[PDB]
Design a protein around this motif. Structure first.
Motif, PDB file in Angstrom:
ATOM      1  N   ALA C  76      18.312  -2.513  22.009  1.00 18.89           N
ATOM      2  CA  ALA C  76      17.798  -2.705  23.358  1.00 18.89           C
ATOM      3  C   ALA C  76      18.202  -4.068  23.903  1.00 18.89           C
ATOM      4  CB  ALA C  76      16.277  -2.562  23.369  1.00 18.89           C
ATOM      5  N   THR C  77      18.748  -4.069  25.115  1.00 26.80           N
ATOM      6  CA  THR C  77      19.073  -5.293  25.830  1.00 26.80           C
ATOM      7  C   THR C  77      17.954  -5.611  26.810  1.00 26.80           C
ATOM      8  OG1 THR C  77      20.627  -3.793  26.926  1.00 26.80           O
ATOM      9  CG2 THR C  77      21.552  -5.653  25.706  1.00 26.80           C
ATOM     10  N   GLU C  78      17.687  -6.901  26.998  1.00 28.07           N
ATOM     11  CA  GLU C  78      16.599  -7.310  27.874  1.00 28.07           C
ATOM     12  C   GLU C  78      16.874  -6.869  29.306  1.00 28.07           C
ATOM     13  OE1 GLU C  78      15.211 -11.133  26.994  1.00 28.07           O
ATOM     14  OE2 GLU C  78      13.780 -11.235  28.657  1.00 28.07           O
ATOM     15  N   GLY C  79      15.852  -6.309  29.949  1.00 28.63           N
ATOM     16  CA  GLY C  79      15.980  -5.739  31.270  1.00 28.63           C
ATOM     17  C   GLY C  79      16.179  -4.240  31.294  1.00 28.63           C
ATOM     18  N   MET C  80      16.483  -3.627  30.154  1.00 28.47           N
ATOM     19  CA  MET C  80      16.644  -2.182  30.101  1.00 28.47           C
ATOM     20  C   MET C  80      15.292  -1.486  30.204  1.00 28.47           C
ATOM     21  SD  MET C  80      19.688  -1.321  27.373  1.00 28.47           S
ATOM     22  CE  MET C  80      18.471  -0.175  26.737  1.00 28.47           C
ATOM     23  N   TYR C  81      15.295  -0.323  30.851  1.00 31.70           N
ATOM     24  CA  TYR C  81      14.084   0.457  31.048  1.00 31.70           C
ATOM     25  C   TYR C  81      14.379   1.922  30.767  1.00 31.70           C
ATOM     26  CZ  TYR C  81      16.318   1.177  35.603  1.00 31.70           C
ATOM     27  OH  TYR C  81      17.213   1.463  36.608  1.00 31.70           O
ATOM     28  N   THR C  82      13.332   2.663  30.418  1.00 33.96           N
ATOM     29  CA  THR C  82      13.481   4.094  30.197  1.00 33.96           C
ATOM     30  C   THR C  82      13.781   4.798  31.514  1.00 33.96           C
ATOM     31  OG1 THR C  82      11.080   4.330  30.348  1.00 33.96           O
ATOM     32  CG2 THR C  82      12.041   4.132  28.151  1.00 33.96           C
ATOM     33  N   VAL C  96      24.375  -5.081  33.070  1.00 35.02           N
ATOM     34  CA  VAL C  96      23.588  -5.261  31.856  1.00 35.02           C
ATOM     35  C   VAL C  96      23.207  -3.904  31.284  1.00 35.02           C
ATOM     36  CG1 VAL C  96      21.486  -6.250  30.901  1.00 35.02           C
ATOM     37  CG2 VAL C  96      22.754  -7.484  32.668  1.00 35.02           C
ATOM     38  N   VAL C 164      26.787  -5.453  27.523  1.00 31.13           N
ATOM     39  CA  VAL C 164      26.560  -6.553  28.451  1.00 31.13           C
ATOM     40  C   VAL C 164      25.074  -6.880  28.492  1.00 31.13           C
ATOM     41  CG1 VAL C 164      26.946  -7.384  30.788  1.00 31.13           C
ATOM     42  CG2 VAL C 164      28.539  -5.746  29.764  1.00 31.13           C
ATOM     43  N   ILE C 166      21.718  -9.522  26.836  1.00 32.36           N
ATOM     44  CA  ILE C 166      21.173 -10.217  25.677  1.00 32.36           C
ATOM     45  C   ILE C 166      20.244  -9.262  24.943  1.00 32.36           C
ATOM     46  CG2 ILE C 166      19.881 -12.231  24.865  1.00 32.36           C
ATOM     47  CD1 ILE C 166      20.734 -13.769  27.210  1.00 32.36           C
ATOM     48  N   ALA C 168      17.178  -7.683  23.432  1.00 26.44           N
ATOM     49  CA  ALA C 168      15.779  -7.814  23.803  1.00 26.44           C
ATOM     50  C   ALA C 168      14.966  -8.368  22.637  1.00 26.44           C
ATOM     51  CB  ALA C 168      15.211  -6.467  24.248  1.00 26.44           C
ATOM     52  N   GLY C 169      13.791  -8.892  22.963  1.00 26.34           N
ATOM     53  CA  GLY C 169      12.922  -9.523  21.988  1.00 26.34           C
ATOM     54  C   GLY C 169      12.697 -11.000  22.211  1.00 26.34           C
ATOM     55  N   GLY C 170      13.447 -11.637  23.106  1.00 22.28           N
ATOM     56  CA  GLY C 170      13.230 -13.006  23.533  1.00 22.28           C
ATOM     57  C   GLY C 170      13.197 -13.979  22.375  1.00 22.28           C
TER      58      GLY C 170
END
Ligand SMILES: [Zn+2]
Lengths: 50, 106, 248, 69, 93, 93
Positions: C76-82, C96, C164, C166, C168-170
């Motif tokens: 999972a990349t940050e900003g991705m949504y279902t 992204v 493309v 970062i 996810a998980g910060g």
RNA sequence: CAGAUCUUGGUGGAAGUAGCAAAUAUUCAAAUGAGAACUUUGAAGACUGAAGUGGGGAAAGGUUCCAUGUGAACAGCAGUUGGACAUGGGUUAGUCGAUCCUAAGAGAUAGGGAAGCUCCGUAUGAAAGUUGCACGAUUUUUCGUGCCUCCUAUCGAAAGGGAAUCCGGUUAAUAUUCCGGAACCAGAAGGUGGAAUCAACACGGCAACGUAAAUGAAGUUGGAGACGUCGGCGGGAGCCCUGGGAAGAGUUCUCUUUUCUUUUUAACAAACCAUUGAACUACCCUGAAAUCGGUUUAUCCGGAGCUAGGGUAUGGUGUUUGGAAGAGUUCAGCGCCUCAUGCUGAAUCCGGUGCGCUCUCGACGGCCCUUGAAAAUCCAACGGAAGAAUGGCCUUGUUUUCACAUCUGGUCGUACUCAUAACCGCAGCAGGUCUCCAAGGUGAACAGCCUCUAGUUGAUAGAACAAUGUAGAUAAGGGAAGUCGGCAAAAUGGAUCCGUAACUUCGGGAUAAGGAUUGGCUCUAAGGGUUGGACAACCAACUUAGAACUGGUACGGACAAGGGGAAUCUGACUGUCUAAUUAAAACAUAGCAUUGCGAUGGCCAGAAAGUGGUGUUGACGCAAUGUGAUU
């Protein structure tokens, strides 16, 4: 434990049958020394070990 | 008071050892072993339970008639009414825009 | 002496605990659609993988050869949504969550789950909060220079795919564990590596550092690189020791 | 066990193949129960009046074996 | 009533683990348990889950956002999105 | 003995071994009071004695621990209704 | 052979000696018997006191279970008795388990190593086929081709998943297994009836959706199975409590319209179901809301459509019934060898209660750098393969996911103990061994104490209280002068009301320290539910606070139940270890710091391997170390 296999139950049946007194007419045979033996097994003294 | 014992040889409080105390027509208090509760089928798109379908164990549905496991609608018994409505609207709008894009590509 | 714990970590009780893990995080099989055009998938689930800080994404694609759908396990990349549409291929857009070859992307872009070789389905930049920067390209004998999270510079073929964005998980390591219980629960779903007993706290039979009337090593902790198993303990092939008072 | 509300269906069930026997039960409250023993279920009909119970008993098929409890 | 001067949510930890560690946990715990706005709905009904999963409540926008461990969006992700957009817009032309 | 205790005997400080909260939880006492107050407010709103504008205010004060019992709530409602009616009479006249 | 702590066997003094003292406790009469302190019966006194000395199971044992006899050996005393001895008898399943599935794992096969015993390996570098489709086919059908697509060995749970049974009775010993009654599930054919289709696959409702049926091949998709922990709230069932009626029994100098027992309703089936109790819980329709409203104990919701009104679904451990009073229970009579132990009379009724206990359900909330199995199996959907009844009427296929009906459901286990005597510990050993149910009073309480149901009265006995002992108590005056050392003991102790320092990481210290009260009786005031015409006579309720009076100036009256303070060294804390001499300052811990490694790699393993782990991994990672909170 009331949950026993067929092989275990048959072994228990054989053990119970073996643990029975020997008749006197068997010991009365001429030239025989079968009068007494230590093979008598009690459920509390000697264990069967499956 | 009367105290009860398990009716089976399973002697542990597992999920398959669910019991209910009953009073018999002999003034006897004793256990009654019962199954787990059923589960209503869920929607495939939204995950919500489906309205109009009873909660039963997986093999208990085989004894039901067809109409009792289905809602009289497209995708009935698999998707909710709102999910079906959204799919119909989405399908029609995307196809109309696909036709528009094809015509305008010339 | 005795076989040390490091030598005893060859398997058995030291295997990873993978009962609750949902699957490998491979990108996809490099096929015709990704090599020539692009393929569209829908992110249907964003879930938590036990033992992994970063979330995982279940993405459903459409099989181009058979009447079937394929579910992937993207990182999972940050900003991705279902419900998001992700695109994988050479002609995918620089957005992204999309998977593109490194040679089809400009300089300075931030990517993740980067392939070392075209087709290994993601090797570089997979932990939470980590990313890989595309430094430059070289058209002749097409190869792309990238900067890894550790600061290393690696050259990869200009056909390796990357996501493309970062991972996810910060920032997960910014929060202290604050007690052994949190550390116990963290490594419980990973492997049998916690807690750790110091070598100087053992006996000479167990560890090279054990023994003595005081807890001390008695020999330099820096051991050579060409050290036999059982004595390769402490600081292995240490270039330098002490506080890193200024490094780049 | 199943219960029958209308008398018509009770006669119809009695006029079948599985109607092996019937039982008459008289309760303390002067209530009469007509029970048919079928292959799968026991069908019970409750009559709260003696006159209707008598007419039902007279209307029962002759080939049916009726036993008082 | 104020009921607490400094520790706040950390006050469940008592007197142990150290004051500085307790304060560092306090700030991150506040971020983790704070509400956030849904960019697709607008309601402040976005909750954390499993350090990276962010779900929105209600009958609408039941989607799940992949964010940071303690915040929905981090500065690094925001900067990465901005530079990706700039690179995309400068490479389309 | 139970009849004597119902009358009020065998109750003093020498007959208590548990704390006051252990014998009777304050949570249950507050729960009983809140349900009684909300039931009275709903009954008054349905009967038309108070409007929804006053009902909302009284609901928040009841949650805010303003009224000690039914008598206090009724007295507060009576004062609010009397002041509202007097102001209405002044405005009409 | 006189030796070798010689070997085997036998037998001495010690010696009728040490001893047969944990777990409160036994007594009277009768019967049997040669013999009674241990057997049986009756009576009395006690104990276990529901986290039991009660009722069952899992593992383990294997006949110890039951009946009838014996008292040679054992039951460290005895024996007429026994888990002993002898002779017989006893375990009855489509519904309970195994059997089926898969988990961690085990393990053939392909293949590769190894001199080899064998090692790795489980779609692996394998020509690894079970399945989908009418092409022949009289004429109304599973028999030889063809073209085919990511299938696949098995073993592995008597606590995981799972198709289906309840009541009453019966034996000396078995029963959810037998008997009587009443059900359910799966499979097979198609025996009837019903339904739709005149020319192929139903209707109604705006909708949520409903029905007695309501044709559906491959393929694909979805759901159930299928899931953490804690906390409060609401409901149901059982239990507990309480008011009357009935039947029987106990006390009755005196009093008590009194005290005690019974007053029961299973699986399954039908109709309702927010009514009686518990969700406007979810969804739908009308409608469009600011003076924003609704609303939980707990602050969530709403122009992405609130409140309100009206509906749809979810439905039992809820209501009314069937089962079913014919059962079971209690009481009262007749025969009077009574035989089948029969026959004949009555009752089994009306109410209520809850911060109550156990289980369960429903809607919620908190926590995670912890997010809390798989598979068998079952169901649903998208889709359209196939069909042929004809002459508006005498005529078919489909449905058997509609109702009734037929047949079948094999094999193995089923006794008993589950422990201060049935298991292990040499034993009938004060040890150890997983789990289910859990009454009343006091009391916060599954604490301690007493009691009800049930069980037991079993731990060799009698006589007498010498020293010294073991265990339990008290003691004038002093109060640690004892001792290495307040070791041991004493003191404190529950609850309510006051008050509480230094220091501190501001969270604590803290129940700091230090003070007062507590019984019984009679009252007072306040705090809540339905309900008849500002109100109201009840019924059904528990708390809090205060006052007077009184007595042993006593009252958490037994039981239960913190001693406290001022400093130093040390370990930050919670946690862990030397089973059987050391629990610590030792180990670990979070924190801090260092080292290697970007996969043709770091670390580890393997005899080798076409071999394995980290790794379902990718620097916020793995591997290797040191120090050990915070400042
Ligand atoms: Zn949202």
């Amino acid at each position: 434990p009331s949950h026993k296999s067929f092989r275990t139950k048959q072994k228990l049946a054989k053990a119970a049958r073996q643990n029975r007194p020997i008749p006197q007419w068997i010991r009365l045979r001429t030239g025989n020394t079968v009068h007494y033996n230590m093979k008598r097994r009690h459920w509390r003294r000697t264990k069967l070990n499956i | 008071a009367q105290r009860v014992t398990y009716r089976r040889r399973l002697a542990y409080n597992t999920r398959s050892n669910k019991t209910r105390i009953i009073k018999t027509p002999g003034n006897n208090i004793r256990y009654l072993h019962i199954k787990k509760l059923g589960t209503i089928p869920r929607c495939g798109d939204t995950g919500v339970p489906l309205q109009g379908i009873p909660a039963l164990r997986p093999r208990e549905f085989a004894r039901l008639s067809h109409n009792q496991k289905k809602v009289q609608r497209a995708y009935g018994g698999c998707l909710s009414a709102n999910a079906v409505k959204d799919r119909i609207v989405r399908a029609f709008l995307i196809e109309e825009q696909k036709i528009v894009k094809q015509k305008l590509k010339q | 002496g005795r076989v040390i714990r490091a030598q005893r970590k060859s398997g058995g009780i030291f295997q990873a605990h993978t009962r609750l893990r949902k699957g490998a995080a491979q990108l996809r099989t490099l096929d015709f659609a990704e090599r020539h055009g692009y393929i569209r998938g829908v992110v249907q689930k964003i879930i938590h993988d036990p033992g992994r800080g970063a979330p995982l994404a279940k993405v459903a694609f459409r099989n181009p050869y058979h009447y079937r759908t394929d579910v992937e396990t993207f990182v999972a990349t940050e900003g991705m949504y279902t419900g998001q549409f992700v695109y994988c291929g050479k002609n995918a857009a620089l957005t992204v969550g999309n998977v593109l070859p490194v040679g089809e992307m400009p300089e300075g872009t931030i990517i993740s789950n980067v392939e070392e070789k075209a087709g290994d389905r993601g090797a570089l930049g997979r932990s939470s909060g980590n990313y890989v920067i595309i430094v430059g390209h070289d058209v002749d004998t097409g190869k792309t220079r990238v900067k890894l999270p550790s600061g290393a510079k690696k050259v990869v073929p200009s056909s390796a795919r990357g996501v493309v964005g970062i991972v996810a998980g910060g920032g997960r390591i910014d929060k202290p564990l604050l007690k052994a219980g949190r550390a116990f629960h963290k490594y419980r779903v990973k492997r049998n590596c916690w807690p750790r007993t110091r070598g100087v706290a053992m006996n000479p039979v167990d560890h090279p550092h054990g023994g003595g009337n005081h807890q001390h090593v008695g020999h330099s902790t820096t051991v050579p690189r060409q050290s036999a198993p059982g004595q390769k303990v402490g600081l292995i092939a240490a270039r330098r020791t002490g506080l890193l008072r200024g490094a780049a | 066990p199943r219960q029958i509300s209308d008398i018509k269906q009770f006669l119809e069930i009695a006029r079948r193949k599985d109607a092996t026997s019937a039982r008459i039960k008289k309760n303390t409250n002067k209530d009469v129960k007509f029970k048919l023993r079928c292959s799968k279920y026991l069908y019970t009909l409750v009559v709260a009046d003696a006159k209707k119970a008598e007419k039902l008993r007279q209307s029962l098929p002759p080939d049916l074996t009726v036993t008082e409890v | 009533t104020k009921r607490t001067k400094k520790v706040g949510v950390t006050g469940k930890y008592g007197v142990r683990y150290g004051a500085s560690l307790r304060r560092d946990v306090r700030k991150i715990e506040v971020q983790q348990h704070s509400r956030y706005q849904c960019p697709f709905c607008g309601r402040n009904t976005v909750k954390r889950t499993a350090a990276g999963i962010w779900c929105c409540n209600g009958k609408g926008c039941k989607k799940v956002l992949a964010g940071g461990a303690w915040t929905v969006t981090t500065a690094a992700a925001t900067s990465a999105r901005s530079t990706i957009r700039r690179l995309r817009e400068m490479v389309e032309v | 003995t139970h009849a004597a205790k119902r009358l009020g005997r065998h109750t003093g400080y020498g007959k208590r071994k548990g704390t006051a909260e252990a014998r009777m939880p304050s949570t249950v006492v507050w729960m009983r009071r809140q349900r009684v107050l909300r039931r009275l407010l709903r009954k008054y709103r349905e009967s038309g004695k108070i409007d929804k504008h006053l009902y909302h205010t009284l609901y928040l004060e009841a949650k805010g621990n303003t009224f000690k019992h039914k008598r206090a709530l009724i007295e507060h409602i009576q004062r609010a209704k009397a002041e509202a009616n007097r102001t209405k009479l002044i405005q009409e006249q």
